[PDB]
């Protein structure tokens, strides 16, 4: 079984890679993009207005080998805002990344 410490270490590496991406990725094509962010779970890039944004299941997951084709989703509204839950948190679908 994968230990808590092993998962914590890989999560820290994932967070560090995310912060490199947030700093290094080129600016969006326009200001109407939803803005990149790290929500403690997934690393989100800039979002195209009016489109779903898909990110691979975070590779630090203990069961990541069981969901290799899965994606976590956000929705970027036409006004450049991440879709919000009715909670003031962004809408998120993690179903493809849940443990089998």
């Amino acid at each position: 079984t994968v230990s808590l410490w092993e998962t914590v270490q890989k999560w820290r590496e994932y967070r560090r890679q995310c912060q490199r991406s947030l700093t290094e990725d080129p600016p969006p094509a326009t200001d109407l993009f939803c803005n990149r962010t790290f929500d403690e779970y997934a690393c989100w890039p800039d979002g195209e207005p009016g489109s779903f944004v898909n990110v691979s299941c975070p590779w630090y997951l203990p069961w990541a080998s069981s969901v290799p084709q899965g994606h976590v989703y956000r929705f970027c509204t036409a006004e450049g805002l991440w879709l919000q839950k009715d909670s003031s948190l962004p809408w998120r679908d993690l179903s493809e990344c849940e443990e089998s």
Partner: peptide, 27 residues
């Protein structure tokens, strides 16, 4: 199957990592 003490102790150890993920997700 799943009838031995090591099965339960291993289950416990794996729950620590899983609760960490749930903590990341829910907040």
């Amino acid at each position: 199957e799943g009838x031995f003490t090591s099965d339960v102790s291993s289950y416990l150890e794996g729950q620590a990592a899983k609760e960490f993920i749930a903590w990341l997700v829910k907040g």
